[PDB]
Amino acid sequence: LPKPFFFEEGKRAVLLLHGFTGNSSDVRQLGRFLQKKGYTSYAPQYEGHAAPPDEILKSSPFVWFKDALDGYDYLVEQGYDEIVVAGLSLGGDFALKLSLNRDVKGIVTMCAPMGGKTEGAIYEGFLEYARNFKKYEGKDQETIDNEMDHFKPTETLKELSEALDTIKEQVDEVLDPILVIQAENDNMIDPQSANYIYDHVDSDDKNIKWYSESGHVITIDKEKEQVFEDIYQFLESLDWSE
Ligand SMILES: [Ca+2]
Ligand SMILES: [Ca+2]
Ligand SMILES: [Ca+2]
Ligand SMILES: [Ca+2]
Structure with a gap:
């Protein structure tokens, strides 16, 4: 099960934020690419993640934002x-909000949703997240159905819906290069x-x-090297002191 990583190179640093039910391995290749260009990068993990899915249900999206702020303060x-803060899916929403709470040189959002529409796509995905995990746990097929009928996601998925709507009303305050x-x-999201x-x-x-x-998980799909390079182009265009 994955864990955070920290690659120390030069003095310009990037903070990497993953998506809902994701983990650091979703952004690891991007971390290795930035390191080879001489950028330092740091990738924290949210509470309940890289863990049994029940841990997510005991958590709150409002904790997950603090895990991001603690990432910045750690750097x-x-x-x-x-x-610079760079965020994937939900992490891209957090990157926007983080820029309103800390001094960043720039923002990168990757497939970040606008709108707390959690029905349909977001719902089944939390369900599949627990299916393949309960399978990973080495649970027989009769069992996987048992704790699944005891999986109540309505709580967690509804705090997620409020959080997103709050951030949508805040996009008009973002000021840093993006x-x-x-x-x-x-x-998964509405690409609009x-x-x-x-x-x-x-x-x-x-x-x-x-x-x-x-x-949707663009940092690991077939076009990822192109996406890495465009991120680098952006970073080099900012006004680093060194
Ligand atoms: Ca150190
Ligand atoms: Ca506003
Ligand atoms: Ca203006
Ligand atoms: Ca530009």
Whole structure:
């Protein structure tokens, strides 16, 4: 089961945030790519994640945001003033909100949703997350159905819906340079969310890129090297002190 990572190179640092029911391995290759370019990167994990799915149900999205803020403060503790935040799916929503609470050099959202519509796509996915996990646990097929009929996700998925709506009303306060990344054929979020973000931030420096062959977990799909390179292009265009 995955764990956070910290790759120390130069003085320019990137904070990487994963998605709902994801973990650090979703952003690890991107961490290795940035390291080879000389960027330091740090990837925390939210509470309940990289763990049995019941742990998520005992948690709250409002904890998960603090895990992101603690990520930023950790980088600063370790000696890094100048930090870009880059976030995947839900993590992309957190990156937007984090920029309103800490000094960042820039923002990168990757397939970040706009709107707390948790029905349909988000619902079945939490269910499948527990299916393949209860399978990973080595549970017979008769068992997997038993604790599944005892899985109540309505609580957790509803705090998630409020949290997202709050952040949607906040996009108009974002000011820092931004790169919006969105997969064209997304089955999980509404890909029009990327247009909502690009059009409504108050940034003076913004950019949107579309990928025509990837899925929602874009950092591990077939076009990922292209996505890494466009992120690098963005980072090099900011005003690092060094
Ligand atoms: Ca250290
Ligand atoms: Ca507002
Ligand atoms: Ca303006
Ligand atoms: Ca730009």
